[PDB]
Design a protein around this ligand. Structure first.
Ligand SMILES: *[C@@H]1O[C@H](CO)[C@@H](O[C@@H]2O[C@H](CO)[C@@H](O[C@@H]3O[C@H](CO)[C@@H](O)[C@H](O)[C@@H]3O)[C@H](O)[C@H]2NC(C)=O)[C@H](O)[C@H]1NC(C)=O
Ligand SMILES: *[C@@H]1O[C@H](CO)[C@@H](O[C@@H]2O[C@H](CO)[C@@H](O[C@@H]3O[C@H](CO)[C@@H](O)[C@H](O)[C@@H]3O)[C@H](O)[C@H]2NC(C)=O)[C@H](O)[C@H]1NC(C)=O
Ligand code: UDP
Ligand code: UDP
Ligand code: MN
Ligand code: MN
Lengths: 459, 459
């Protein structure tokens, strides 16, 4: 909750609230409301609310809400870092120190930058006390006249009859991580008489750079095409034929959970057979797991490559921008094309209820330098993406049936999504064993749990 | 990199270098050297060096080093943040401000905590300037007598004849992210006459919590067993039989790239058929892509569950500790068991050469509260792990033949690994087509590129 109330220190100062601004803050009170029903108005779009709590019996719901709270608290505990703690720099300290930007790998050692004591010259003695909790301090060299206590310990003191001596000594302080952890931080204390500063040294490994060999744009080397089929071999073969018309050696990975699978083969085609009805997002997951190239192109099995499906153009966007995923446009026989550019946002709910997801059509802004391309949160099922980022988000195998934006919501904030309308694929002009209704309730329960959601509006 | 040379300000101050401490710093000069050959001596362990550069013609090497540098620079550019920049807090400033811990979601708004001006009373006027680059400032409420300039702009000024007024006004300052980005930061300027502070607001989404229903421990709900087989149906059936003796309803996912696949079926078994020789790590990747449970158990197809193979115990470690992956022990028919606890570290090499990997047997420290369990970097191919972390690291499908520790190296720093000797699986007492030596050269070139490695020592 944002606290607008005056501390007693300033209760005597009058303040007129800006409603306009207080409205921008997080009030942790979200809900999901439907558009008034009836005949729709021009310009206005109809908003439909889903109450995810209605996917459970209220008895079950209380159980779910409890176990979900427990799992969330667990999640917090594993994920949160001393570097995420709110630290306020004090005013009017002699203490100069690094506030951010200081990092060491577990069990290694660094010179600490920018440590200094800017006090008054003349004072008989000058002393600074450094405290760590996951490391130890030492000096790269000893300054004549500075006395050190606790070299190679968690607590170091430096004391000097000369201020220039002390400061030069500080320029040489080293920090060492003592115990192995993968990704954490030490909140160190730098102090002198009547003054205290807290700062954080991050203890972590450099990230896996996951560098791919370019091996201009070699599409066969850079891109693998991934799809999932179920009992639609005609569409699938028509797709592969259409791909081969423009890209003869690009790999096509096909996941398939058909009951009696047909043989799918040809040069540069890889067929994966799954247990019957394992599902949609699982085949998506399977297909992506097999990609060896920097990039993966998702297409549905009922799509058809044209001359408008210029993958070079998508490759270009990913090569030249920080995007992770860039969607094309899928065009009907009717000549209408969609980019299905979607915005997803999660809004904070009351404590223990969970959050509210808002989906609405749209985008954030135009992608500078690339006309017809925008940045949004979700796109249609025709996209090129960095294989690694896709795998990193995943196609949750639990979504066995009806699912699309759930990938983009799993990816929310982690995946940098764009959408280009000029790269176009065609959509070609008994299929679900069991209760769709069940699958839907199942999905709602899953989304409720997995994302801590109470409800959602679709728009 | 380390500069120990004095700025002219202190060149006149004598310093005696501590060799033992300067020795702890990164000198960016690593190499990989073999133990002297000849007959081994009883206490020494033999260290073998691989020069990864030798896996290429001088032509190929120059090409790959260039391309690798390019891809690395790209990687840096997409990954690095203003929040990683070194900031030094100045001494003797009246400016109090948040040094870390302040974060807003893209396009959202927060009260900035801890802003104030601790100047002395008695001045005729007090003014502060706030500057942002990816956001704008406003106030939640207006203090009588404080003049605001730039409300809703990147630059805000607060001017006041009263210091208490200014500070109350500061308590109400709000920051708003203006442009949509997924994970970045704004470095703000807080300023008053003759004084400047820099601090960073992180602009990012809260992470996907990825909560699992628990469903003591329901192993069928929590754990899926994953394996990969190739023409070893007898071992595989022996494995499934052995599992079913202790765990009748735990799902077993089997990836299989046999040329002539046999039927593998029975309750709770899922068989995945792959193109012949698609490979080792790919089947591993495939199997994990199909796991729907919080946890996955990796077992080789030649393993055999006994009464020692008590998964509850592994489940327990992951439920009660921040580990992501916990390896068991694999016992030979000879009665010897291995946990294959491995340490991997990357050491900085000279500019443009790449880094050195050191693998050595060992662990970091004992896992407090769990006798016989340790924290290490790599383990044997019997382990329970959080599915999501396994998928996040990946079994690179390019490792089609011989690979094991490459998963742990891909995960290095990202995966919290442990190993318990008391959970024990038996190893039972038609090889891949192609050239081993080719695969090995291939893998060397891959590791050279992928991980920016020049060389490695095995120990
Ligand atoms: C663009 O990338 C593709 C894919 O990486 C390159 O094609 C691949 O090139 C290698 C040779 O550099 C081929 O390997 C050869 O395979 C045959 C067996 O098929 C074997 O007899 C040879 O000894 C050799 O290993 C590989 O087959 C080939 N793959 C494809 C998709 O055809 C391609 O050269 C790159 N450049 C351009 C400009 O296309
Ligand atoms: C431990 O976790 C497993 C997870 O599979 C639990 O078993 C599963 O429980 C669900 C819900 O009760 C069963 O669903 C039902 O299946 C029948 C058909 O088999 C169907 O008619 C119902 O509409 C419903 O979908 C699911 O089959 C079952 N899976 C099995 C038996 O392996 C198991 O109950 C948990 N154990 C305990 C004691 O908590
Ligand atoms: O098993 C599937 C196949 C597709 N889709 C989604 O539905 C779209 C396809 O819609 P269409 O009306 O073309 O149905 P189709 O007959 O092509 O499956 C895809 O883009 C997916 O996002 C789904 O949820 N499950
Ligand atoms: O296709 C494969 C199968 C296994 N392994 C690795 O080799 C070990 C198995 O060694 P073993 O001597 O038991 O050989 P196996 O005949 O069991 O494959 C595993 O634990 C894996 O890490 C591999 O590199 N490639
Ligand atoms: Mn369709
Ligand atoms: Mn074996």
């Amino acid at each position: 909750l944002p606290d607008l109330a005056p501390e007693p220190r300033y209760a005597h100062i009058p303040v007129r609230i800006k409603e306009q601004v207080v409205g921008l803050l997080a009030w942790n009170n979200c809900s999901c409301e439907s558009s008034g029903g009836g005949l729709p108005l021009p310009f206005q779009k109809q908003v439909r609310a889903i109450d995810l709590t209605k996917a459970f019996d209220p008895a079950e719901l209380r159980a779910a809400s409890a176990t979900r709270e427990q799992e969330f608290q667990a999640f917090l505990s594993r994920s949160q870092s001393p570097a995420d703690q709110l630290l306020i720099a004090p005013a009017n300290s002699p203490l100069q120190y690094p506030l951010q930007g200081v990092e060491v790998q577990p069990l290694r050692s660094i010179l600490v930058p920018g440590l200094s004591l800017q006090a008054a010259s003349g004072q008989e003695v000058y002393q600074v006390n450094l405290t760590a909790s996951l490391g130890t301090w030492d000096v790269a060299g000893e300054v004549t006249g500075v006395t050190l206590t606790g070299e190679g310990q968690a607590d170091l003191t430096l004391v000097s009859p000369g201020l220039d001596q002390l400061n030069r000594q500080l320029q040489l302080v080293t920090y060492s991580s003592r115990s192995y952890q993968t990704n954490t931080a030490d909140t160190v204390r730098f102090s002198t008489e009547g003054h205290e500063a807290a700062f954080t040294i991050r203890i972590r490994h450099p990230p896996n750079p996951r560098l791919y060999p370019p091996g201009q744009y070699n599409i066969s080397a850079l891109v693998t095409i991934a799809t999932k089929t179920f009992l639609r071999y005609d569409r699938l073969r028509a797709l592969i034929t259409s791909i081969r018309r423009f890209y003869p050696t690009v790999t096509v990975v096909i996941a398939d959970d058909s009951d009696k699978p047909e043989r799918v083969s040809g040069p540069y085609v890889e067929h994966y057979l799954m247990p019957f009805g394992k599902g949609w997002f699982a085949g998506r997951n399977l297909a992506v797991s097999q990609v060896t190239t920097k990039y993966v192109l998702w297409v549905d099995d009922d799509f058809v490559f044209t001359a408008r499906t210029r993958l070079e153009r998508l490759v270009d966007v990913l090569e030249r921008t920080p995007l992770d995923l860039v969607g094309g446009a899928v065009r009907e026989i009717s000549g209408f094309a969609t980019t299905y550019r979607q915005l997803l946002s999660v809004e904070p709910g009351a404590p223990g209820l969970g959050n509210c997801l808002r989906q609405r059509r749209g985008f954030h802004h135009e992608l500078v330098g690339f006309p017809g391309c925008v940045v949004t949160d979700g796109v249609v099922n025709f996209f090129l993406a960095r294989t690694d980022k896709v795998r990193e988000v995943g196609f949750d195998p639990r979504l066995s049936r009806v699912a699309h934006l759930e990938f983009f919501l799993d990816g929310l904030g982690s995946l940098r999504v764009g959408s280009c309308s000029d790269v176009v694929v065609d959509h070609a002009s008994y299929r679900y064993p069991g209760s769709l209704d069940e699958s839907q309730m199942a999905k709602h329960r899953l989304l409720f749990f997995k994302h801590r959601l109470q409800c959602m509006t679709s728009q």
